[PDB]
Design a protein around this nucleic acid. Sequence first.
DNA 1: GTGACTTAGGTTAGCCTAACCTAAGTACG
DNA 2: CGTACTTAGGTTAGGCTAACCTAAGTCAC
Lengths: 138, 138, 91, 91, 228, 228
Amino acid sequence: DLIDTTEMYLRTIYDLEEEGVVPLRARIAERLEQSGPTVSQTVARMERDGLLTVAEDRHLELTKAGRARAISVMRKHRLAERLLVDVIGLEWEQVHLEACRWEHVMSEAVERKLVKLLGNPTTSPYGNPIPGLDELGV
Amino acid sequence: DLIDTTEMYLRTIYDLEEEGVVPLRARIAERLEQSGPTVSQTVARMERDGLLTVAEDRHLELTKAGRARAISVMRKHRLAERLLVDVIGLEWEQVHLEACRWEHVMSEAVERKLVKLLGNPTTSPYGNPIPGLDELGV
Amino acid sequence: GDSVEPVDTDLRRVDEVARSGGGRALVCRIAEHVQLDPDLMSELKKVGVVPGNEIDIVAVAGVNKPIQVQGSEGGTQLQPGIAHAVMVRVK
Amino acid sequence: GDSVEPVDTDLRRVDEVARSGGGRALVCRIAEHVQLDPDLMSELKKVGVVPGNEIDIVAVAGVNKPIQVQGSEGGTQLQPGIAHAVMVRVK
Amino acid sequence: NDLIDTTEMYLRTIYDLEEEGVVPLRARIAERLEQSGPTVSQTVARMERDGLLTVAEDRHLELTKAGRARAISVMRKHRLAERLLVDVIGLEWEQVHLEACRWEHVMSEAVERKLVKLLGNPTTSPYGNPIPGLDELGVSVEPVDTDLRRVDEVARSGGGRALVCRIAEHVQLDPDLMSELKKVGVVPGNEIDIVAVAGVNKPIQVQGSEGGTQLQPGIAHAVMVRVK
Amino acid sequence: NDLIDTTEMYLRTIYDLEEEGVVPLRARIAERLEQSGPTVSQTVARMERDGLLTVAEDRHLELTKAGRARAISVMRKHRLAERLLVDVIGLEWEQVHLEACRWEHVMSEAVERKLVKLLGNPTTSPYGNPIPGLDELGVSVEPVDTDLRRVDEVARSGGGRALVCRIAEHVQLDPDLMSELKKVGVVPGNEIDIVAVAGVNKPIQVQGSEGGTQLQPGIAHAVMVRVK
DNA sequence: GTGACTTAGGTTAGCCTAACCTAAGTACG
DNA sequence: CGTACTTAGGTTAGGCTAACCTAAGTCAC
Ligand SMILES: [Fe+2]
Ligand SMILES: [Fe+2]
Ligand SMILES: [Fe+2]
Ligand SMILES: [Fe+2]
Ligand SMILES: [Fe+2]
Ligand SMILES: [Fe+2]
Ligand SMILES: [Fe+2]
Ligand SMILES: [Fe+2]
């Protein structure tokens, strides 16, 4: 369904930060349509693996390693969206759900090829900036 | 059936050495009533774990660690036999098959108590010397 | 983090622009939250709420009240959670 | 390793003593191989082939031929593999 | 820590939980034997298939006739081993259970019958627990046991002086604790003073002949006493 | 190395083995996907339960109607992905398979139909393998391809000159080898000279336009050619 | 008093090693 | 030409983590 649970939790926390929403476990439960117990257990696993920390106010804080992985996934997502709209010609409304699955399987090798093909894009088709282009070397 | 596969392979190789028989995998197949493939696979596993080596003439040679573990099992076996005959009064013919199971579960703590109880025995009820009494400290 | 903290400080959320007394603005960003509803995205395309298009944001009062927006090819109602996730530059 | 290499160098296997022309000997060791057959161990006890007992080993010729032994309470036939696994001191 | 026989240990853990008056759930086996939830469910499903137990609607494990017979067989071997280890071999009080927990899997009925004679037809383990299935061996008026009360329940009911009668298998698993109990004198056939406490999840204070100590709620639940 | 979807990869591995003319046993899946014997049997038993395949009497795996449909769907996505990666994106020839092996699990039919138009109704992958299930999308006279012979069988039959037509998925799994093949020029649409050998298990010598190399019996079996 | 989260006990999918099997081979005095 | 062993492809028992669920609690402005 999600393809990669960890990556979708990371990107969901990133989404909420972009919206200026407080990233709570309750928000992930809504967005990914999962039970509270599931989200708390998965967040605890990601805390143990050093990808985030639950603060005193209870908001989810990405670590250095957590943010680095979240950026990677979001970068792949928005480059996939650019490819799907500009080249493949998939319908504007269907692109996100396609790019949401593609973000988990794309290598950095393909990302660097897409950057050249698409003429060094800085935003997705929906105007959202593409982060972590520094980490690709472009 | 065997309770501990590793320990029974080690003690079977020790048995064959005591009998002045060449310890081949074919001998273990007969004694433990297991297929040739089974014995070769289990001996390869014990070789990998550093308990024995297959020589050029194909006879099984216990390592330092293998011999140490084989002595430990045989010591427990013959002390169990002494207890079963001298104290518990189990019939002379039934004792070995009982002691063959007890050898896998006895701690060195009990061995040291049995040495005191049985008056520092040096042989089993069947005349076989008890090895590795040095390693108990007795 | 241009995505989290806009380099363009003039970028404002549609809900905040509406609550402040509306205005004409250029659509800049549609967040991943909005994209998750395809039927809504189709409706946004139809009436012309897409990056690089000017829209009129109607003034609104009270939280949990839907925001009216007028595009080039008609108008539509945004939920507060949706209007929060669309960013614009007011002209 | 008194068990593998006997400290008492006079210890000999019943099959070897038989093949060398038999003799009277004291039973010393019955190996774990022999113990695995309870019915045989019962028969060994009955006729008096047990550690600390004197037995007469009958002279035999040819490998893969059973060894006749006389105990205090009668006699019995040992298989070559069995007679190999019983050790005695010839008196 | 190796179980030696997985099936026999699952059966005896269900038996232990019944003796402690605890609902035998798979969750209880998982924490007791330190195994994963999925492992316990798969092993219980394998025992169910072989007809040693059944999973009820409320999920509590129910031993079949064959299951109970096998569970009793294992527990009998355990407490006869414990008797042998203490009375004859002289293994230290705190080390006996762990030893006996391995021996229970390898002892024949043949040896059990020989131990009954050697130990003089024992009816209770060194920790005061009754030895079941002695009928099956071929061997006594069964004590009433209704007057026995759990140290936790005595403490919540206002405490008082009581005689230590049973220390359950659950308590025996911690040797360091069993050494503490022996020192202060919380052992079978010794009088103790149970201090009064209010509500569950509170550690019960007990005063032995040679000082006092604290018991956790799950430990106090497993120690049985006759109040004066 | 993560499979992304276990079921889809088991199906496509069975498909690969049929294309190579190898008897699809569970032993083959264990080798290919580097999983344990017990793992493969348990996963195949799960797929059998869901009705995607059946284990025969001779123990070779047989895809059901649903199984074959799903296997084709995955392989179609795989070779359309390979076409996109080579023709449009420009990913290096030796890296394309491993990428496409992940993409096959996430691509919708919606995109497949868009890729068909973009790539001009492709019928073969960049490695010469035909693209199946194009009827299911909604898209040609299929080549007979009975004239195609395996490099190992051509070598054992006395060798000779031949045109490289197909490099199977099995061969694509080794990028370092695929780089070696590209350098010497053992690629689709290139002529090679296959050296004669006697008996199985022997490595076949091949001479390309830019030098020669050695193929293992299992690699040579997976390369298909038309002999001149 | 509703929103956020924990407690408690499950589940399926997907991996593993150890330890047994047969059937049909190969290698050697 | 048996004796010892390998090759090839299974099996069951007994372990694991990741990742989903519900029901019924607690904690807080
Ligand atoms: Fe998106
Ligand atoms: Fe996603
Ligand atoms: Fe013995
Ligand atoms: Fe044994
Ligand atoms: Fe105990
Ligand atoms: Fe046990
Ligand atoms: Fe491929
Ligand atoms: Fe794949």
